[PDB]
Design a protein around this nucleic acid. Structure first.
Ligand code: K
Ligand code: K
Ligand code: K
Ligand code: MG
Ligand code: MG
Ligand code: MG
Ligand code: MG
Ligand code: MG
Ligand code: MG
Ligand code: MG
Ligand code: MG
Ligand code: MG
Ligand code: MG
Ligand code: MG
Ligand code: MG
Ligand code: MG
Ligand code: MG
Lengths: 23, 86, 128, 74, 137, 71, 48, 118, 142
RNA sequence: AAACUCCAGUUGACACAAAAUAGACUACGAAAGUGGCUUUAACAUAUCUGAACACACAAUAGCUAAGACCCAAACUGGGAUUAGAUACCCCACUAUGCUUAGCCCUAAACCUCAACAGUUAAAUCAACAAAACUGCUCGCCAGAACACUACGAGCCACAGCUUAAAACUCAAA
C-alpha cells in the first residue's frame, strides 16, 4: 500500500519533536 | 597464517600454460564461492539485506531448477509430427 | 539432597547390586550422574512420603510433586544464574501452574491437599 | 489426432457427422451467423475424447449444454 | 606419469625438479593486486628478498597505477632485478582481485621467469573486521 | 561419525580451499550433513583437522562428492 | 545385563597401582580411528 | 558421566611423555574420576601451528583418556590442563559412544511446495 | 506458485522448440508472458550442456587440454542457430589454436549434444569468439 | 658507510573485536531473538480461554558509572561537487556498536494471519493478499483531520514512555 498515512504521521512527529526542541 | 603454505588454492602450471592454470584457479575459487564471498565483503552488507538476498537467491534457484525440470519433461514430445494432416 | 552414594533409580532394584565392586557402585551412584538423575530420586522420595499410591504418576498429587521438584531445580539454577531470564520465566510459570493444581486439589480432596502442603512445605495463599 | 482419420471414416460410413479439427469459437452458440439463419444444429453430440490437446475440457461440452444438445462422452 | 595440478607435498619423495631444485627450494614471487596499485616482490625459499617492483615505483601515478599495463610493467621490472640474482623458476603467490592480478604475472614471464605454480592468498576473514558501509551511487 | 576420523571428514571438504560441501554435493541427508559439519568444526579447532585445505594425505581417498574441478 | 557387563570391564579399568604399566603399554601401541566411505556405502579401512 | 579427553602432548621422549600421562591421569583421579582406558593415536604433524606456554609447536602426541567423573570435575580438569606446560591442547567432550544412534529408514523426500512456502 | 508466475492455462502443453514449428505459426501470434521463460531457461540448459563437455576429457583430449571457458550461450528464437561465446586468451598465437580445435570440435560436439535426447534437435552451434576483446588484439596485429 | 622515515612488501609474534564454507538447511525459543568450540545447568502446564496497568520479559537507538578499543561510525573537520550542498562522493576522527552493573521499555516488535477446537460438504469467493468456513473465548474498532497531540494520572523515564480527548474545519477520507 501507499505510505500517505505514515507520511502524515511522519510530518506530525517531526514538527512536534522540533517544537519541543525549540521550547 | 598458522597453516602450511603452497597447499591451499595452489595450482601447478603444465607445459608453461599459465593462462590455463590461472583459469583453473579462477574456476576453483569461483565454484567454492570465494570470489563472490570476497566481492560481497568489500562493503558491509547489513543483516536485513543479507537475509533478503539469501532468501531471493534460494527461491530463484528453486524456480529455475523447477522450470528446467518442466522443460526437460515437456521436450520429450518435440519429435516430428506423427499424424501430419490430421 | 540424596547422598551422592545413592544408586540411580534404575539400578536400585536389580538383584545383587549390594555385592558388586565398590567401583561399580560409584558408576551407578548419583556422584557419576547429571543433576536430573538426582531429581528423579528426590521425586521418588516425595512420592512415597506423600501420595497413597507411589506408582500413580497421573494423579493430581504426583503432578504437584513432580512440578515442585522442577521448581526447586529452577531456584537453584537462578541462584547461580541471576540474569537468566529464560529460566526465571520457567520458574514463575511453574509456580503459577502449581498454584492452579493446588487450587483444584484443595477443592476436590482437602485431606490430600493437607498432606501435600505438609509434605512439600507449601504455604497455600489465596490470590489478591 | 491419432484417431481423427478413423473417426471421420466412422461418421461417413454410418451416415453421420464428424468434427475432429480445431473447433472454432461459436460454431454452436453462433451457428446461425456462421452457417445461416436456417442451419439445423446437431440433435446429439458424441464425444470420443472430452479433452482438448491442452488437457482442458473440449469447448463443445459447455457449448453443447448452452444449446440444450445432449452429449454422449467417453 | 600423468600431470598433477596438486603441488608436491614437502617431506614426501617426489621426482619433479626444476634446474635441480625441489619445489620447496624455488623462489616465490609475491604479487599484491590491489584495486589502485600492484606490488610484486620476489623472495627466496629462505625468505631473502631479491627484487621489488610496483606500479608506483615504475612512474605510474593516480588512476594509471590501477591498470593492467601498469602491473605488467612492474612485473618486467621485478623480473629483471631477480634474473640478475639467478632466478629462473618462481612460485607465484597472488593476493587480491585487483586489475594487476593476472597482468602482473604476464610481466614476470616476459621478463624471463618461468612460472611453475600459481597460489591465491587473498585474505578472507572467517566472520573479522566490519567493512566500511555500502556506497550510495 | 567421529571427530577423530579425519579421513572420513576430509572426503566432504574442498581440496583447494577446505570449504565444507553442501548436501547437494555430498549427497548426505540432513542428519548426517549436520553430524559431518559439527564433526569437521570440532576436529578443526581441537587440533585434528586443518581448516584452510584438505590434508594432502587424504587426496587419494574415494571421491564420493559430485564436484568436478580440474581442467 | 548391563551391571554384569560393567562388572567385567572394571577389571580392565586403569588404577593407581596399574597406572604405570598401562601408560607404558599405550606408548607401544597405536589406535587408529581413520576410515573412508565409498559411493556404495562400504567402509575402506586404512592400510596398516 | 562418561567423558573423553582428547589430549595433544608436546613432542617429547618416551620417559617425559609417560610422566606427563601419569601426571595427567593422576589429576583426573584426584578429582574423583574413574579412568577406563588410555589410547595412543600416535605422534603426527599438527594441522596448524599451535602456540602454547610461550612456545611454538608443529608436532604433538595425540592421546585419548576414557573416564567417568562427576559433572563438577570437568571445570576443574579444564583448568588443570591449562597450566601443564607439556600439554599443547586438551579438550574434554562427552564420550561419543554414550550417545546412541537412532535408526534411519532412509531419506524421505521433502515437498517442493513447502520449500518455497517456508 | 511463486511471485514468478505459473498460472498459464496451457501449462500442460508440450513445449516444442523446433525449426518446423516456427514456419507453422500464426503471423499475428506474439510471444506470451511466460513464453520467454521457456526460452530463457532452455538457453541456460544449453550453457550447462556445453560447459560439461569442455571439462570432461572423455569427449576429446584436445578439447580438455585447451580448458576453454564459455562466456555466454544464448540460443536464437528462430531455432535456426545457436550463439555460444568463449573467452579469448592473451596470446594471439594461443587464440588460433583454441579457435581451430573448437571449430572442428563443434561438428562432433553437435552429435554429442544429440546424445541428450531431450535436446536432440540442436541447431548448428555458432561458436562466436567474444568477451576477450577479439577486436583489440586484432587492432594490435595491425 | 651512516642514522632517520609516518610509509610499503615477505616472515614471525599477537585481542575484552567479529564468528567464511556448512546454511540449497528451515531448526530452536513466549516473543525479542538464536548459526565458531567445549562443558555445566537447562527448555512451565495429563482441559481450554484469561490483563495498556498485575507478574516477568522485550531488537536497535539512548541514559548512568567503571573498563576495552581491531574495525566500523552519528556528529565534527578537511577535500571535491553544486546556482546553493550545513547532502549524495573521498579522507580523518569522536559519541556509539563490546564487557560489567544499573536503568530506559520503543520498532514496518510484521506470517501486517489473536488463542483453542473442528470441517473440506455447502455458495468457492467483493478485490488483492495467504483456499473457504464453523464453534468458543478474550482484546479491539465505529467518517476524515485535529492527534504517536493537550490536560489528568503513573513511571529510576525530566527535550521521555504509557493511557488519551475536545473545540474550530471538511464531504469526503
Ligand atoms: K566462524
Ligand atoms: K481491558
Ligand atoms: K513483515
Ligand atoms: Mg500534519
Ligand atoms: Mg493461559
Ligand atoms: Mg498481554
Ligand atoms: Mg505499549
Ligand atoms: Mg530494550
Ligand atoms: Mg548500550
Ligand atoms: Mg570509541
Ligand atoms: Mg577507522
Ligand atoms: Mg522482527
Ligand atoms: Mg489471546
Ligand atoms: Mg475519527
Ligand atoms: Mg512513538
Ligand atoms: Mg506524548
Ligand atoms: Mg502530561
Amino acid at each position: 500500500k501507499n505510505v500517505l498515512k505514515i507520511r502524515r504521521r511522519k510530518m506530525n512527529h517531526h514538527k512536534y519533536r522540533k517544537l519541543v526542541k525549540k521550547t | 597464517a598458522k597453516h602450511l603454505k603452497f597447499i591451499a588454492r595452489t595450482v601447478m602450471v603444465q607445459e608453461g600454460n599459465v593462462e590455463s592454470a590461472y583459469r583453473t584457479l579462477n574456476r576453483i575459487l569461483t565454484m567454492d564461492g570465494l570470489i563472490e564471498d570476497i566481492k560481497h565483503r568489500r562493503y558491509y552488507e547489513k543483516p536485513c539485506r543479507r537475509r533478503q538476498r539469501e532468501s531471493y537467491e534460494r527461491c530463484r534457484r528453486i524456480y529455475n531448477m523447477e522450470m528446467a525440470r518442466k522443460i526437460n519433461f515437456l521436450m520429450r514430445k518435440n519429435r516430428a509430427d506423427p499424424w501430419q494432416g490430421c | 539432597d540424596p547422598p551422592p552414594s545413592t544408586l540411580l533409580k534404575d539400578y536400585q532394584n536389580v538383584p545383587g547390586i549390594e555385592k558388586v565392586d565398590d567401583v561399580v557402585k560409584r558408576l551407578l551412584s548419583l556422584e557419576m550422574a547429571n543433576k536430573k538423575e538426582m531429581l528423579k530420586i528426590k521425586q521418588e522420595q516425595f512420592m512415597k512420603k506423600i501420595v497413597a499410591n507411589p506408582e500413580d504418576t497421573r494423579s493430581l498429587e504426583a503432578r504437584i510433586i513432580a512440578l515442585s521438584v522442577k521448581i526447586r531445580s529452577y531456584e537453584e539454577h537462578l541462584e547461580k544464574h541471576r540474569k537468566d531470564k529464560a529460566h526465571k520465566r520457567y520458574l514463575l510459570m511453574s509456580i503459577d501452574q502449581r498454584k492452579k493444581m493446588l487450587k483444584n486439589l484443595r477443592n476436590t480432596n482437602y485431606d490430600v491437599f493437607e498432606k501435600i502442603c505438609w509434605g512439600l512445605g507449601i504455604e497455600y495463599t489465596f490470590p489478591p | 489426432r491419432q484417431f481423427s482419420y478413423l473417426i471421420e471414416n466412422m461418421a461417413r460410413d454410418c451416415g453421420e457427422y464428424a468434427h475432429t479439427r480445431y473447433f472454432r469459437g461459436g460454431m454452436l452458440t453462433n451457428a446461425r451467423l456462421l452457417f445461416g439463419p436456417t442451419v439445423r444444429l446437431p440433435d446429439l453430440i458424441i464425444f470420443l475424447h472430452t479433452l482438448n490437446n491442452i488437457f482442458e475440457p473440449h469447448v463443445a461440452v459447455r457449448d453443447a449444454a448452452k444449446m440444450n444438445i445432449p452429449t454422449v462422452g467417453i | 606419469t600423468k600431470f598433477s595440478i596438486y603441488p608436491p607435498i614437502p617431506g614426501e619423495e617426489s621426482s619433479l625438479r626444476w634446474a635441480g631444485k625441489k619445489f620447496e627450494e624455488i623462489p616465490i614471487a609475491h604479487i599484491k593486486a590491489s584495486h589502485n596499485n600492484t606490488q610484486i616482490q620476489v623472495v627466496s625459499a629462505s625468505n631473502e628478498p631479491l627484487a621489488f617492483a610496483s606500479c608506483g615505483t615504475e612512474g605510474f601515478r593516480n588512476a594509471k597505477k590501477g591498470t593492467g599495463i601498469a602491473a605488467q610493467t612492474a612485473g618486467i621490472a621485478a623480473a629483471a632485478r631477480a634474473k640478475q640474482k639467478g632466478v629462473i623458476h618462481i612460485r607465484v603467490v597472488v593476493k587480491g582481485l585487483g586489475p594487476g592480478r593476472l597482468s602482473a604475472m604476464h610481466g614476470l614471464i616476459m621478463g624471463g621467469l618461468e612460472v611453475i605454480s600459481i597460489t591465491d592468498n587473498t585474505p578472507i576473514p572467517h566472520x573479522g573486521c566490519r567493512p566500511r558501509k555500502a556506497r550510495k551511487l | 561419525v567421529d571427530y577423530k576420523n579425519v579421513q572420513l571428514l576430509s572426503q566432504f571438504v574442498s581440496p583447494f580451499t577446505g570449504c565444507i560441501y553442501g548436501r547437494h554435493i555430498t549427497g548426505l541427508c540432513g542428519k548426517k550433513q549436520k553430524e559431518i559439519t559439527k564433526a569437521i568444526k570440532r576436529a578443526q579447532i581441537m587440533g585434528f583437522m586443518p581448516v584452510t585445505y584438505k590434508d594432502p594425505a587424504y587426496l587419494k581417498d574415494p571421491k564420493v562428492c559430485n564436484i568436478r574441478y580440474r581442467e | 545385563r548391563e551391571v554384569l557387563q560393567l562388572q567385567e570391564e572394571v577389571k580392565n579399568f586403569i588404577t593407581r597401582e596399574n597406572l604405570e604399566a598401562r601408560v607404558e603399554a599405550a606408548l607401544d601401541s597405536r589406535k587408529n580411528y581413520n576410515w573412508a566411505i565409498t559411493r556404495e556405502g562400504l567402509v575402506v579401512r586404512p592400510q596398516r | 558421566p562418561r567423558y573423553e579427553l582428547a589430549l595433544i602432548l608436546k613432542a617429547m621422549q618416551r620417559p617425559e611423555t609417560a610422566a606427563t600421562l601419569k601426571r595427567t591421569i593422576e589429576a583426573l583421579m584426584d578429582r574423583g574420576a574413574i579412568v577406563r582406558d588410555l589410547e595412543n593415536l600416535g605422534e603426527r604433524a599438527l594441522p596448524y601451528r599451535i602456540s602454547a606456554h610461550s612456545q611454538q609447536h608443529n608436532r604433538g602426541g595425540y592421546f585419548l583418556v576414557d573416564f567417568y567423573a562427576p559433572t563438577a570435575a570437568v571445570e576443574s580438569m579444564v583448568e588443570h590442563l591449562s597450566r601443564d606446560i607439556d600439554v599443547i591442547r586438551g579438550n574434554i567432550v562427552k564420550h561419543p559412544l554414550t550417545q546412541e544412534l537412532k535408526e534411519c529408514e532412509g531419506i524421505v523426500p521433502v515437498p517442493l511446495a513447502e520449500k518455497l512456502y517456508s | 506458485k511463486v511471485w514468478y508466475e505459473s498460472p498459464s492455462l496451457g501449462s500442460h502443453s508440450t513445449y516444442k522448440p523446433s525449426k518446423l514449428e516456427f514456419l507453422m505459426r500464426s503471423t499475428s501470434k506474439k510471444t506470451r508472458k511466460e513464453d520467454h521463460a521457456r526460452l530463457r531457461a532452455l538457453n541456460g540448459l544449453l550453457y550447462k550442456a556445453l560447459t560439461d563437455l569442455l571439462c570432461t576429457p572423455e569427449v576429446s583430449q584436445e578439447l580438455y587440454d585447451l580448458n576453454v571457458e564459455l562466456s555466454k550461450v544464448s540460443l536464437t528464437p528462430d531455432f535456426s542457430a545457436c550463439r555460444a561465446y568463449w573467452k579469448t586468451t592473451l596470446s594471439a598465437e594461443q587464440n588460433a589454436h583454441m579457435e581451430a580445435v573448437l571449430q572442428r570440435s563443434a561438428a562432433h560436439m553437435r552429435h554429442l549434444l544429440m546424445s541428450q535426447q531431450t535436446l536432440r534437435n540442436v541447431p548448428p552451434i555458432v561458436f562466436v569468439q567474444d568477451k576477450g576483446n577479439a577486436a583489440l588484439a586484432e587492432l594490435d596485429q595491425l
